[PDB]
Amino acid sequence: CRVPMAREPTVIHGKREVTLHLHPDHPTLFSYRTLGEDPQYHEEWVTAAVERT
Amino acid sequence: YEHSTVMPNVVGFPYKAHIERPGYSPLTLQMQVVETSLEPTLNLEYITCEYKTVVPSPYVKCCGASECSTKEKPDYQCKVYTGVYPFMWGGAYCFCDSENTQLSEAYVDRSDVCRHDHASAYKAHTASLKAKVRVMYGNVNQTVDVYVNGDHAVTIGGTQFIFGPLSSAWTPFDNKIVVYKDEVFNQDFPPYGSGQPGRFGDIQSRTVESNDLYANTALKLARPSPGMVHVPYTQTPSGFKYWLKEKGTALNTKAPFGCQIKTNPVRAMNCAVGNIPVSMNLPDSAFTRIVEAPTIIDLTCTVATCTHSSDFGGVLTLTYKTNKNGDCSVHSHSNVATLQEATAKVKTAGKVTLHFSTASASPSFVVSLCSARATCSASCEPPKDHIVPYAASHSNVVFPDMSGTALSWVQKISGGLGAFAIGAILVLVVVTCIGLR
Amino acid sequence: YEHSTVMPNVVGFPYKAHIERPGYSPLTLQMQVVETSLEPTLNLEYITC
Amino acid sequence: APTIIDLTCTVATCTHSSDFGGVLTLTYKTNKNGDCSVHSHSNVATLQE
Structure with missing residues (x-):
């Protein structure tokens, strides 16, 4: 079954954090987990351009 | 050895x-690990898949009276009505005007296809590590698969390695897990035979092929509307489907320590936790005779530049005085620094350069070239990127060593302060002494 | 950087x-400069001939 | 990049002329051969190379 690969985000580096310029064109997922101990997970459906940090 | x-x-x-x-x-x-699967032992508590409500055609024995012929199918429901007037197309269904019966019946059954679309409900209790390790000594450049428990003994061209049990028994999987297709949720499924309508496991088969099918689903019948031949029922929707919509964040996206999750042989890979004790038995053939190893005299460290970056951001050159040319081992006895190279080539000109990573502003580690030693030091620099795409190459040792500019300043203030305290103590004691004698 | x-x-x-x-x-x-033009904006008040 | 150790100045002759009227030789101890940067952090001097 075929499936597109979404636009790669424009990473912006910062002190101990990033700010991604998500640029979708149809509802996609986005989940980041801090692979340390007791992570800070997250999972949301991006529908339009956003600036998630 | x-x-x-x-x-x-x-x-x-x-x-x-x-x-x-x-x-x-x-x-x-x-040596270094390349992948570490963590497989827990499972017991298949039960299997759940979307139900299917079988509704046999009503047996409308009109001009008479039918009876509720009870059955034992999962959640079987049989209802008998009276004073009902079916109206099959083209006119009434029988010459009677009243005194008629409809034997409505309906019962749950597993979907026609859930050998492909079921959601197991395993119950995992004990973990079992399994790692792929690469070893590079002399020249073997080999990789082996071992079970990290202390009983698997792998032989790599002579030498024998036994990877003891993992220091910590931490396991991301909770007591009960639910594996659907590719995710392993840390749910708490209801025990077999106690599924509730609507939520997970309203339909519970003991196994994919078995036929037990505890099917509590609140399937309820209702009298047909006059002048029609439906068999209405009010069944709470597929509980399994509602679980799909409200499954929540799967363990794949919240496993601690960045443990990647795979499903078919359910496992957690690349779990970065604890230490791996290693015991090694070595034959003498691997080692090298001292009389043949180029001897090293007057070993000296001089760090060209140190930057405690995530990768190897520090270069140190060793000045020595050898007797011949060849190769032999190097290593940092301390842990604050990790060398990139393992074996360096020794030449008549007493100069060899090594790259090391670190995480301390003022690291200090006893370098060991071939057979000698040299107390090694540095004044390191912090990088300016805030981010890199590769993991660390240095144990996170950030505490400096004495003689560091940070501690040296602390020593200076304390030393001056201590002398002031001593001077006051001596003066007071002298005063007390002369007062007494 | x-x-x-x-x-x-x-x-x-x-x-x-x-x-x-x-x-x-x-x-x-x-790096070194080689020429720095300093052009100001103008407004032609009038012309005298 | 080649590593440098034991760096020390020695000015053969300095005449503070408009051009590069000062020559200094640096004695060092490297591990290999190559090219890399040289610069005077202070402003009282300006290197040509």
Whole structure:
């Protein structure tokens, strides 16, 4: 079954954090987990351009 | 020659064991894990898949009276009505005007296809590690698969390695898990035979092929509307489907320590936790005779530049004075620094350059070239990127060593302060002494 | 990698910026001006001939 | 990049003329051969190379 690969985000580096310029064109997922101990997970459906940090 | 050591369980960490057999040239041994599957033992508590409500055509025995013929199918429901007037197309269904019966019946059954679309409900209790390790000593450049428990013994061209049990028994999987297609949720499923309508496991088969099918689903019948031949029922929707919509964040996206999750042989890979004790039995053939290893005299460290970056951001050159040319081991006895190279080539010109990573502003580590030593130091620099795409190459040791500019300043203030305290103590004691005698 | 420096606005002065990137060999970046036009905006008040 | 150790100045002759009227030789101790940067952090001098 075929499936597109979404636009790669424009990473912006910062002190101990990033700010991604998500640029979708149809509802996609986005989940980041801090692979340390007791992570800070997250999972949301991006529908339009956003600036998630 | 038995040798025991511990390596961090971090995939992609170039650990370097440094065995020192008296009467033999020291030998370095660099090894690293490349993948560590963590398979827990499972018991298939039960299997759930979307139900299917079978509704046999009503047996409308009109001009008479039918009876509720009870059955034993899962959640079987049989209802008998009276004073009902079916109206099959083209006119009434029988010459009677009243005194008629409809034997409505309906019962749950597993979907026609859930050998492909079921959601197992295993119950995992005990973990079992399994790691792929690469070892590079002399020239073997080999990789082996071992079960990290302390009983699997792998032989790599002579030497024998036994990877002891993992230091910590931490396991991301909770007591009960639910594996659907590719995710392993940390749910708490209801025990078999106690599923509730609407939520997970309203339909519970003991196994994919077995036929028990505890099917509590609140399937309820209702009298047909006059002048029609439906068999209405009010069944709470597929509980399994509602679980799909409200499954929540799957364990794949919240596993601690960055443990990647795979499903078919359910496992957690690349779990970066704890240490891996390693015991090694070595044959004498591997080692090198001292009389043949180029001897080293007047060893000296001089760090060209140190930057405690995530990768190897520090270069140190060793000035020595050898007798011949060849190669032999190097290693940092301390842990604050990790060398990139394992074996360096020694030449008549007493100069060899090594690259090391670190995480301390003022690291200090006893470098060991071939057979000698040299107290090594540096004044390091912090990088300016805030981010890199590769993991660390240095144990996170940030505490400086004495003689560091940070501690040296602390020593200076304390030393001056201590002298002031001593001077006051001496003056007071002298005053007390002269007062008494 | 951002790096901000100041050069003297003197034609033909071989300025030599020196960027020290930790984790990398320091790079000397020499640069010099060759001509600096200073054009102001005008408003033709009138013409006299 | 080649590593440098034991760096020390020695000015053969300095005449503070308009041009590069000062020559200094640096004695060092490297591990290999190559090229890399040179720069005077202070402003009282301006290197040509």
